[PDB]
């Protein structure tokens, strides 16, 4: 069994998005989202009892769920998009599972879809600026990868030859609407000034690649 979802979308604030879920061998489908750093939030779905939509109160008046039985596909259309609607939207079958005293109950059962990311933003695709985090036992150094959109960037060190001690942090969304991240590495203090440390930054959406050597400051 599989639920196949439509693809990731970048949408302007105020616009609407329509995400789809198609079953692989008709079920009632529900939608649950997860915004970055937040918990699971049920949006709405088709009821397996009434075969009509049910919505969470917070979205009532702004979401429409429909189903084309002829294509085994269910759709969630969310309008008047806001920044806080940026989230991964998952679909799942809402399946009647048991009854008690003549009342039957449905659950969101496995497997869910893989999720669809909807990013609500006015930002255009843009590659990052890369700045050194220069080093001052064990020393730390790094690269600040600033002002890119959308996610993701990747960072390697010394073209992949340096992996131990690396931490590449999750990106943060800045108030400007652009993402930023740092990648750091700890090395022996004695190696500074003899060895060369270069961060290799790739941002595929903008096809930007930047290499930045990170050295002690004079």
């Amino acid at each position: 069994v599989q639920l196949v979802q439509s693809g990731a979308e970048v949408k302007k604030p105020g616009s609407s998005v329509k995400v789809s879920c198609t079953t692989s061998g008709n079920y009632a489908i529900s939608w649950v989202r997860q915004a970055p750093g937040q918990g699971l939030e049920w949006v709405g779905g088709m009821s397996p009892i009434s075969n009509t939509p049910k919505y969470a109160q917070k979205f009532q008046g702004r979401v429409t769920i429909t189903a084309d039985e002829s294509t085994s596909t269910t759709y969630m259309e969310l309008s008047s998009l806001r920044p806080e609607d940026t989230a991964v939207y998952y679909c799942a079958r809402d399946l009647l599972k048991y009854c008690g005293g003549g009342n039957c109950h449905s659950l969101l059962v496995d497997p869910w879809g893989q999720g669809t990311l909807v990013t609500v933003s006015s930002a255009s695709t843009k590659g990052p600026s890369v700045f050194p985090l220069a080093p001052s036992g064990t020393a730390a150094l790094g690269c600040l990868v600033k002002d890119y959109f959308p996610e993701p960037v990747t960072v390697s060190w010394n073209s992949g030859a340096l992996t131990s001690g690396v931490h590449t942090f999750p990106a943060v969304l800045q108030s400007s609407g652009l993402y930023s991240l740092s990648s750091v590495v700890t090395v022996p203090s004695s190696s500074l000034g003899t060895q060369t440390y270069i961060c290799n930054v790739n941002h595929k959406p903008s096809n930007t690649k930047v290499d930045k050597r990170v050295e002690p400051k004079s």
Binding site: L40, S47, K97, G113, S129, L144, F169, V172
Partner: protein, 213 residues
């Protein structure tokens, strides 16, 4: 109307421990309660429904109990696969409503962070902004406080933090805090400091620099 809460928000435990986490409903919901497991960035998985019924294929170390307003999920011997966030969920014909989740991480010994501060690069300054970065490396547990001080004045509202997932080798966390100022504001002050409070440190550790030195 119905509000589901969970406690504790976080739990640290060792492989082999007996773990119990709690879920509360703001009004009685009989046995209409399910539990879900979620690993980061992956779809959740149903564990328990009807408060105590194990979903098909779920390992029997999971069990649930409760009725009315108070529910619990118990893992009789926590296994490596079980570090995850657990959500309870009330279901009825009209809605589903999830609790906020409990994250279960892997216990290890306390480890204080190693702290580093990085001034803005001259190159970034040439474009009009100053990012100052404070790094807390390889610490445990997760709770940590970073305070930025600029000529002793405590900063608020102008920093953002990011944390790594627990490391698969040494079970630690690392954290960056970034203070962002305009070039003009950066040039109004001299001493830039990051003060870190963590229970592995008897006293907070401060790393600082003087602008332009």
């Amino acid at each position: 109307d119905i509000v589901m809460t969970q406690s504790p928000s976080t739990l640290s435990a060792s492989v082999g421990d007996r773990v119990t986490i709690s879920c509360r409903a703001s009004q009685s919901i009989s046995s209409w309660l399910a539990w879900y497991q979620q690993k980061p960035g992956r779809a959740p998985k149903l564990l328990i429904y009807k408060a105590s019924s194990l979903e098909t294929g779920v390992p029997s170390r999971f069990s649930g109990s409760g009725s009315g307003t108070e529910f619990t999920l118990t893992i009789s011997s926590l296994q490596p696969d079980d570090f995850a966030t657990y959500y309870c969920q009330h279901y009825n014909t009209y809605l589903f409503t999830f609790g906020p989740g409990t994250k279960v991480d892997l216990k290890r010994t306390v480890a204080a962070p190693s702290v580093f501060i990085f001034p803005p690069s001259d190159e970034q300054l040439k474009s009009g902004t100053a990012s100052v970065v404070c790094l807390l490396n390889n610490f445990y547990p997760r709770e940590a406080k970073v305070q930025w001080k600029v000529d002793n004045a405590l900063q608020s509202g102008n920093s953002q933090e990011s944390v790594t997932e627990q490391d698969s080798k040494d079970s630690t966390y690392s954290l960056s805090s970034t203070l962002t100022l305009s070039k003009a504001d950066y040039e109004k002050h001299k001493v830039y400091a990051c003060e870190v409070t963590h229970q592995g440190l008897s006293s907070p550790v401060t790393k600082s620099f003087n602008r332009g030195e």
